[PDB]
Amino acid sequence: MDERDALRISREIAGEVRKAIASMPLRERVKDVGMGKDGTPTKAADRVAEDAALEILRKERVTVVTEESGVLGEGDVFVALDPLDGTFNATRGIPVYSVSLCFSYSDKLKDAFFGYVYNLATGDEYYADSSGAYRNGERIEVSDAEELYCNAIIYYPDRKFPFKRMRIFGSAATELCFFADGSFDCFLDIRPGKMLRIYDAAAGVFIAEKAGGKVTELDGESLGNKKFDMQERLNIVAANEKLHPKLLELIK
Amino acid sequence: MDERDALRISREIAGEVRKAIASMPLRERVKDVGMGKDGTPTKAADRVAEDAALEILRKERVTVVTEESGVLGEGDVFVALDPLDGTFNATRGIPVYSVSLCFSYSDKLKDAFFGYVYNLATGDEYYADSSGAYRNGERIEVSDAEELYCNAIIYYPDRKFPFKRMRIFGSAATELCFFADGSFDCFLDIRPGKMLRIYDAAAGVFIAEKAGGKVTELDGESLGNKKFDMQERLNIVAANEKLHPKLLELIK
């Protein structure tokens, strides 16, 4: 498989996933249907979403990692999948939630060749391959935000901070694409618990990097060897080249 | 003018403003045209929305209160208007932005008789009146959660909090409706630098209260004396009756 195929498959899935959820009323959406492999409630909206995506990835030779079902298949191309990133918003009808797809030629983040995040409430399509990163077919780049006095997305502000704005929308994949296109100056998940997961973050991170952002763990080190399995966890500091060090500086 | 005239007027307004913004590209929305009564810039999105609103409004016997154009007119129904709350979101295609209107029978919030918040992105309509609070014409009520381990919108977390989730979406009027809804268990604007202005607070305050919430100043003071005219900005502590007393202690 290659980048154009991943892009064709991802679009297949988003189209099918968006119709599975769009026609499901909030009342149906919010009901628990099971417990995820990941340990949290599977909501009905997650499993309808998760089901439309699996019927596509099934016909392809891959190893998929997902929240509800977990590790699946035995293909050489690994897929980190969040069929529904922003479930809480979806169940509440808040228009910020996405499908997120990251494909890798190995079990580790550093071998990623495609990343895709599709917001299912707006039709906004974000992706990245070798030719760069795009929003709805258009080239995107991080901001040239060199001041600390900037627009941050952060999980979770814990103290006084110097940001012009602070936002938290409930969809990490999607907010990583808000960083990537330059609509926010940085993204931070510095929760000491290290609560962000690999299917949640991998499409976003890769996309953010293709758009020029620097994307590291808490301490500035590379995420390159993050594993596409259920037990991986991460923290994230992401901003352009000049701003990134100041941020690391800030939180240290 | 009565609560029924107020719904009719709000709806036509929602229509014009929805029409105009929907027609302009992001690159346009974001231009500074640009100086309003607070010293914050007026973006092209802001002006177009205001113009559409005001055109409809001051055909009425009203005093308009807006940040952009300040206090307009001399009629004695007072209308707190913000034609586009969530401007930063709107200019980047992030779909949480609304037109907000609160009609009172004096310049004081306590004489409020109608509140109206329309999601310009999604078409969600919230309103309240002496009959009750609605979302897309279905009556609503606030959650009844009683613990601080709840779902909170909060401008801004500065210390360690016990909440189950914290969110910050960039449109206080919409966000007070998320609370009004039960979607979120509380709404907190505790910023030491009380920045919230009455025209962004009044309607969602109005709707949340008709939906059963307790909504007061930061120390628990009543909001009925806050005025549609000027200089003072709000702090807000919004929650069901059982959680509100607890929130007041916590932000001690």
How would you describe the overall organization of this protein?
The structure is a homodimer of 252-residue chains. Chain A has 252 residues and is α+β, with helices and mostly antiparallel strands. The first copy, chain A, has 2 domains: 1-138, Fructose-1,6-Bisphosphatase, subunit A, domain 1 (Fructose-1,6-Bisphosphatase, Chain A, domain 1); 139-252, D-Maltodextrin-Binding Protein, domain 2 (3-Layer(aba) Sandwich). In chain A, 29% of the residues lie in helices and 27% in strands. The first copy, chain A, has 7 helices and 15 strands. Chain A has helices spanning 3-22, 26-29, 44-57, 87-91, 172-180, 198-210, 243-251, and strands at residues 32-35, 41-43, 62-66, 70-72, 77-85, 98-104, 112-119, 125-128, 133-135, 138-139, 151-155, 165-167, 186-189, 214-216, 236-239. In chain A, the strands form 3 sheets. Chain A has an 8-stranded mixed sheet with strand order 4-3-5-6-7-8-9-10, sandwiched between helices. Chain A has a 5-stranded mixed sheet with strand order 12-11-13-15-14, sandwiched between helices. In chain A, a hairpin with a 4-residue loop joins strand 8 and strand 9. In chain A, helix 1 (3-22) runs antiparallel to helix 3 (44-57). Chain A is globular. At the A-B interface, strand 12 of A face strand 10 of B. It is classed as hydrolase. Keywords: dual activity, FBPase, IMPase, archaeal phosphatase, apo-form, hydrolase. The assembly is dimeric. The entry is titled "Crystal Structure of apo-form (P32) of dual activity FBPase/IMPase (AF2372) from Archaeoglobus fulgidus". Chains A, B are fructose 1,6-bisphosphatase/inositol monophosphatase. Organism of A, B: Archaeoglobus fulgidus.
